[PDB]
Design a protein around this ligand. Structure first.
Ligand SMILES: Nc1ccc(CNC(=O)Nc2ccc(S(=O)(=O)c3ccccc3)cc2)cn1
Ligand SMILES: Nc1ccc(CNC(=O)Nc2ccc(S(=O)(=O)c3ccccc3)cc2)cn1
Lengths: 471, 473
């Protein structure tokens, strides 16, 4: 069972003896710190953490004794605030006397703005605020995935619109392939759900259960997929029977969309000779609602995609759309699901546009690039203390390393507001109390063990929409 | 609760309709596929996966119905193999008819060798082999962390030995700071435990319980830490009271080691004026078993470390060790825990060496670089089918993309052997049965729902030792 007393950085166990004596309050905030591009971020993932790890009775006699035993060996010393945790158990029935206020999930906020604040509600629990920093900071991941996924959506929207004249099916242009490529099962579900903020296609099943349990959607499921082959279902037929493999698979899935990896031995042979001649008759008869999706999986992503399109373009009836770009027949599409990150995605669609190929023809699958190749310093997700009350006096506190002005933190009590021009601004030093900037955008989402405000995955998707989608 | 039927890539749900008819066997393997660095990998993490996810009754009536309902909406169609999973439930009481053979955990194996193999033990469950691919491929992470952590230990060993003459305290030279920097709680435990294969210092507590539960050690805990400050325990005192903060903290932890982050406002001022002058009397009186550890946390890592060292060098009695390198007094040490990955680590220790500073003086803390900034691409961890039996005929299968020879996979039944020179070699096409390379070094670790072989964390650590560590005496 999960023990909150064992879910923090080791050194934080000793922090209760380090704060100034007579401190009744520690007030801390979280931000995606600005750097001297990712200029805006999707806030998402906190609600998962609040429900799974923070709410309800999270402190028991056993969990205190368990932590006491581990830390005694871990530090080779008795440093442990047993009295502090005992107080929470006896006074609040193990509920955390903590208040968390946050911007609504799905909200797109520019860098350098307060996203959520944390403070203690009982003077005795001044130390508790930063105890849970570690677990709260891990919200960097769904934030970063949601943000990076959305930035890829912008690129896709831009080129799809320019080459086709609309945004039909945009929410299916980036498919999640990252299940095997992430660090754990929990990460898989969290990352997949963050991608589903922007798109509807995934193969990381674990994301669906997470969303249903912690967020919920009106639709039965927030994510979908199509039948598809892997290298094993092709190669098992033997080197000389790749055509037999292809034919068997498209026949088994003739009434639904089907993706078939075609690079097992020779991708260019498979497209031109096998799909393009030998099995062409099984392709041109397929429904528009059930196309074949050819899937390359090796070589230079841009060069391979272009050559595949070039090959298919001469074996299948190609039309030219109203924008002047070439379009494959509705029964034939391509997915590039290898080597795809935000960088190569940009290079590929730009490369396609150069060769007069519409983005209608292609979709992208991304695994490690989508869910794993991301870190905390990408958006500079940081948790810092900005306000304390010592001896009854409030103090505006901050860090400001001389050798790195970028790591400077904000001072005092914070609030997030709309600017007159409709942008965002974070007010420091409690200046939000002057009420010159309208209502604080931060809402109490957690207080004293209870989740006080929630959001459905539907609301979140609404909030995180692209401007071009709104227009 | 965990549902193994819902713990695979979506398209694998449709794969049982795609294999050649009358296929009774699917046999697959796992390798860190070959391509100058990371030439050998530490195999670790599979035992965790086997116990937490694969062993015992992992199939129930409810889990089948649950998966059925999800996939129906997920695919907008009914492609779920309900009959297949029912067979497993009815015939084997939910236990997976799978055999897994694997190299011992902790073992150090060169790239391009078979690390583990998977095959179905029931002809009916031919589809089961690659269903669990996704869940097994995730072992890439503890493999990659342990490997990357060990490569850093090599760097540390080299420079510590050269600057000091020995390797005393090497296992504490790289500390885990990555709890907040990973993608989840589970990842935190898995990653931290992987680091602990090579070192003993961690702040990621979640690693301890994982090891105790799934691996075990003779000692009460596999990892240790020391009292330390964060910026909040310094800045809360106020801008003009950094000295008071320092003094309070070192006094509270006067008889134990204590790390104190010193860059809140001015790292160079804190080292020279506050530590080096104002509170000097509180530092030189400290025990050798309870030193102050000064912690910079900003600026260019190499430049900052050298400057901090030069500053302390002129404020404290520095000695020169037997190798001719400068050494801080035993009550004073430094940890650099910002911007540390395998590349910057190398740059720092080399820079220290050129300035005649011993690696005895310093230790490193690493967070995102140690536990998060890693992918499956790094060691090319890959799972591939190499052998099937269809119509009673065994077929050696493989992929070999025309545009990427590096993605070529191995053929047929695999086995791992010792060469006459004592190296590793992977034999393909069932050639291991020729008995020219002796016995298969793989062990059956999982069979029919039961873990058949396992390793304590102590033995895993022993297996993962460095050659330089083994050279004794
Ligand atoms: N890890 C993994 C998982 C799975 C795979 C292989 N599956 C795979 O490619 N599926 C796939 C393909 C295409 C599209 S689509 O383009 O959105 C599309 C959808 C419907 C109709 C037309 C087009 C969606 C899904 C590889 N690796
Ligand atoms: N995420 C996190 C966690 C924690 C921190 C700050 N804690 C921290 O630096 N601890 C620390 C310091 C030094 C050493 S040591 O050098 O191995 C050492 C050990 C004993 C005696 C002498 C020397 C080990 C641990 C930052 N970030």
């Amino acid at each position: 069972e999960f023990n909150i007393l064992l879910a923090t950085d080791s050194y934080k166990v000793t922090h209760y003896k380090q704060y100034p004596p007579n401190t009744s309050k520690v007030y801390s905030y979280f931000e995606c710190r600005e750097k001297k591009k990712y200029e805006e971020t999707v806030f998402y993932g906190l609600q998962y953490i609040l429900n799974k790890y923070l709410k309800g009775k999270v402190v028991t006699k056993e969990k205190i004794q368990e932590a006491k035993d581990v830390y005694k060996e871990h530090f080779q010393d008795d440093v442990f605030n047993e009295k502090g945790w005992n107080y929470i158990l006896e006074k609040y029935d193990g509920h955390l006397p903590i208040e968390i206020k946050a911007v609504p999930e799905g909200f797109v906020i520019p860098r350098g703005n307060v996203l959520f604040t944390v403070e203690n509600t009982d003077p005795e629990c001044y130390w508790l605020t930063n105890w849970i920093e570690t677990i709260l900071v891990q919200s960097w991941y769904p934030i970063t995935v949601a943000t990076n996924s959305r930035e890829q959506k912008k690129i896709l929207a831009k080129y799809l619109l320019e080459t086709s004249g609309n945004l039909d099916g945009l929410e299916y242009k980036l498919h999640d392939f990252g299940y095997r490529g992430v660090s754990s099962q929990e990460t898989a579900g969290i990352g997949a759900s963050a991608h589903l903020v922007n798109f509807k296609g995934t193969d990381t099943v674990a994301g669906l259960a997470l969303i249903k349990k912690y967020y919920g959607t009106k639709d039965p499921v927030p994510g979908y997929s199509v039948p598809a082959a892997e290298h094993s279902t092709i190669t098992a037929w033997g080197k000389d029977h790749e055509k037999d493999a292809f034919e068997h698979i498209v026949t088994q899935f003739s009434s639904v969309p089907v993706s078939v990896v075609s690079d097992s031995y020779d991708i260019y042979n498979a497209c031109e000779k096998i799909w393009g001649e030998d099995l062409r008759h099984l392709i041109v008869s397929r429904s528009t609602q059930a196309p074949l999706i050819i899937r390359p999986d090796s070589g230079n992503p841009l060069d391979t995609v272009l050559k595949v399109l070039e090959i298919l373009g001469k074996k299948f009836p190609v039309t030219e759309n109203s924008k002047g770009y070439k379009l494959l027949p509705p029964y034939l599409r391509v997915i590039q699901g290898d080597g795809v990150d935000i960088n190569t995605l940009q290079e590929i669609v730009e490369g396609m546009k150069q060769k007069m190929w519409s983005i209608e023809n292609i979709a992208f699958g991304s695994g490690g690039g989508l869910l794993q190749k991301l870190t905390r310093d990408l958006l500079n997700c940081s948790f810092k203390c900005s306000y304390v009350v010592t001896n009854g006096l409030g103090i505006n506190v901050f860090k400001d390393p001389v050798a790195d002005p970028n790591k400077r933190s904000k001072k005092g009590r914070l609030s997030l507001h709309r600017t007159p021009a409709g942008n965002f601004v974070t007010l420091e030093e409690g200046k939000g109390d002057l009420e010159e900037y309208g209502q604080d955008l931060l809402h109490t989402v957690f207080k004293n063990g209870k989740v006080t405000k929630s959001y459905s995955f539907d609301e979140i998707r609404k909030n995180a929409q692209l401007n071009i989608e709104l227009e």
